[PDB]
Amino acid sequence: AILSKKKKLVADGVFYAELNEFFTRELAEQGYAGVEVRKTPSKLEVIVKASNTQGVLGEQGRRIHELTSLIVKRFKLSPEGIAIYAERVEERGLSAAVQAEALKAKLLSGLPIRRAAYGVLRFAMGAGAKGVEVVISGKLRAARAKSQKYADGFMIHSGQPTRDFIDIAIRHVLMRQGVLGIKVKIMKDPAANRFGPRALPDAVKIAEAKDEDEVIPAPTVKS
């Protein structure tokens, strides 16, 4: 009903947080990356970014139709008040969420870790990432647990720029002997950034010398 300004913006955020996890659990197998809630008059546009937009929009769009119905019945929304669109992620290699979900689907198929880990190192860089580092922790046949880091290229660690040019995704992998924890850190190239800064804070680009012309003593060029 009547809800305060402080309590309304938080509710929109809380709604987003709960809605986002719902897609992660339901659309985990389709490389779910993220969701964008575009509020508009007379409609609630929701844009989901996934590696595979066929599993959501399958068999005459039955799943996406049967999936928007699960949201009208839980948030007491009018059947016409919400519309869900499925959009393909443009650069699948630059999304750590897609890369972490892809790694889990390989580890659960029994593929070796080394072959699986290098499959995301090269896929991230091939998409144009400035750097990438993958950490996989857990237990594998051995009673003792271990973690292994797989770095590549250039990575920044401290300060604000990690919030601007780095996206991260952690998932738990359910194995027959325990839980495997994977961390996929991908740093995008700042030159391709279209909303924030387009370079690192300490990058200084000096222009070139425009000099080395020939000076003539003192004429006047009229027009």
């Binding site: 300004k5 913006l9 938080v10 509020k39 008059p41």
Partner: protein, 102 residues
């Protein structure tokens, strides 16, 4: 029910889109000869929550300090009600919500 003194209240978490919508409405209220009052910068509200870092209760007593800035702006327009509402759809933005009160 014609020309009225009409208030549009703008609230959002991020200021860039808030000022774009605010300036775009002001821009459209300039070429259209509509007298306007605003935008009025309301004192921003800092919603702060301070939790413990430890999920357990072991270690040094370290705390997080999260923040959620809420910026509120109100703009007063002197125009008929049909004109002001269509201005809102011209300057519709996902982040900023709009409420209109007479």
């Amino acid at each position: 029910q014609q020309i009225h003194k009409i208030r549009i209240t703008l609230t959002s978490t991020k200021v860039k889109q808030l000022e774009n919508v605010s300036a775009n409405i002001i821009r459209n209220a300039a070429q259209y000869n509509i007298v306007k009052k605003g935008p009025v910068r309301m004192p921003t509200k800092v919603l702060k929550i301070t939790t413990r870092k430890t999920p357990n209760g072991e270690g040094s007593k370290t705390w997080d300090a999260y923040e959620m800035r809420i910026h509120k702006r109100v703009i007063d327009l002197q125009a008929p009600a049909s004109t002001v509402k269509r201005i809102t759809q011209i300057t519709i933005e996902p982040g900023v919500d709009v409420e209109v009160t007479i």
